[PDB]
Amino acid sequence: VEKVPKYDIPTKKVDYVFIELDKMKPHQQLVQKELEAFIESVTGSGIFWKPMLLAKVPGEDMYLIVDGHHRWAGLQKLGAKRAPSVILDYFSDDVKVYTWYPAFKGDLNEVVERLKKEGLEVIEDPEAEEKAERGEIAFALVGEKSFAIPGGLEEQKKVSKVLDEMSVEGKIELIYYGLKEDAREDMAKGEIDYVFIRKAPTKEEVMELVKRGEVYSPKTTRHVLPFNPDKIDVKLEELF
Ligand SMILES: Nc1ncnc2c1ncn2[C@@H]1O[C@H](COP(=O)(O)O)[C@@H](O)[C@H]1O
Numbered sequence: 001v002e003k004v005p006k007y008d009i010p011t012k013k014v015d016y017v018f019i020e021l022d023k024m025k026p027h028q029q030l031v032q033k034e035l036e037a038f039i040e041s042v043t044g045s046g047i048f049w050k051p052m053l054l055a056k057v058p059g060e061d062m063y064l065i066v067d068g069h070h071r072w073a074g075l076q077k078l079g080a081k082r083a084p085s086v087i088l089d090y091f092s093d094d095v096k097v098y099t100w101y102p103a104f105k106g107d108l109n110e111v112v113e114r115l116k117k118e119g120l121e122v123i124e125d126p127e128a129e130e131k132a133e134r135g136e137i138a139f140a141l142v143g144e145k146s147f148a149i150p151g152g153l154e155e156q157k158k159v160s161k162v163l164d165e166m167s168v169e170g171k172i173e174l175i176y177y178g179l180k181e182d183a184r185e186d187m188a189k190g191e192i193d194y195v196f197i198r199k200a201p202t203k204e205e206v207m208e209l210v211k212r213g214e215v216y217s218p219k220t221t222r223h224v225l226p227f228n229p230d231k232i233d234v235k236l237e238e239l240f
Contacts, residue, residue, distance in 0.1 A: 002100075003186075004178035012227035016051040016084035016234070021076050024054065024063050024083075025210045029157075030073050031218045038074040046236045051229050052083050055090035057210060064210050066090065066223055080239040086229045091203060094226040099200035100219040102163055103183040103192045106172040108143065111194070114166055115149070118158045123148045135199035143187070143194035153216070156198060160217035163196070176219050 042048055052068035065072055066088060075083055088095065104111065112122050122141065125131070125148040132140035132148075138155035141147040149155060166172050175192065177183040183195040201209075201221060209216065 001175045002178070003175050003182055005182070007224065009225065009228050011230050013230045014086050014227065016086055016229070016232055018082045018238075019052070019054060019063060019085040020082050021072055021080065023061065024052065024065050024068075024072050024085075025057065026065050026069050026072065026215055027206050027210050028069055028216045028220055029218050030069060034070040035074050035077070038070045039078065042074065042236055043078070048084065048234045048236055048239060049231045051232055052085040053088055053223075053225065053229070054085045055088050057207065060211070062210075063087070064090070064207060067225075075239060080236075082239050084232055084234050088225070092226070095203075096224040097200055097203055097206065098178070098222040098224060099198055100176040100178065100222050101180040101183050101195050101197060102160070102219065103175050103177050103186070103195040104163070104172050105191060105193050108145075108194060110171055111162075111166065112147075115159065115162050118162055120155055120158055120162075121148075121150055123150070129197055132197045133199055138198065140197040141194055142197060153214075156220075157217045159196065160219070164218075178222055 050071065052071060053066040054063040055066050057064055063085070068083070071083060115122055120138075124145055126146055128137065128140035128146045128148040129142055131137045137148050138151040139149040139159055141149055149159060163172070163174060167174050175183070177195070180195060180197055183192055186192045187195065201216070206221065
């Protein structure tokens, strides 16, 4: 579940170009339910109406997937070869990269234990949020108390993996907030107990990870773009 600000992003009529799926590089792990929903939808209508948003990888014959991970993965699993795509000026100041703020209503002790079980530390620390925003720890975990979760990407992946696991199990309610202060607003309402805060990746870091053949956890990047492409008229049969 997502709570984003009411982003007035304009729709613009940008044309698409077919790009081969094997030239597209993901920067996040897939979410299997999102993959499956895309597959049901596209095969249901046989129309692919939402172009991929791509960025050329400097120095390679390859494109970063900016938006479209499950479209990409779902088309590949169906046997398709290409997708209609819009190529972005990614390094333009008009494109911004934020993150998501996983927030939870639930009990901190089950969550702290099942983080500790996957190898993480969870250390009470009043500077945790400050450290996380400078990118010095994996996450700050902030509610009634404040906890530092040390590490880097490996530990961020475990946190995401645990928060999704105990969703799958059913012990927690979980909103990904676009803004941490909207999670802190709702925190004060009683609807949210804890929020996980990490530093957002930069563009250069996103490219760097992709060039290393690595990926972030789901819900790591939150791109704010200068436009949403207008919808397109492409038949699924055209993609094979
Ligand atoms: N028939 C379709 N053609 C293209 N995109 C679709 C279709 N049905 C659903 N979607 C989108 O597929 C996306 C799957 O997630 P992602 O590709 O990660 O953005 C969602 O944003 C859906 O809106």
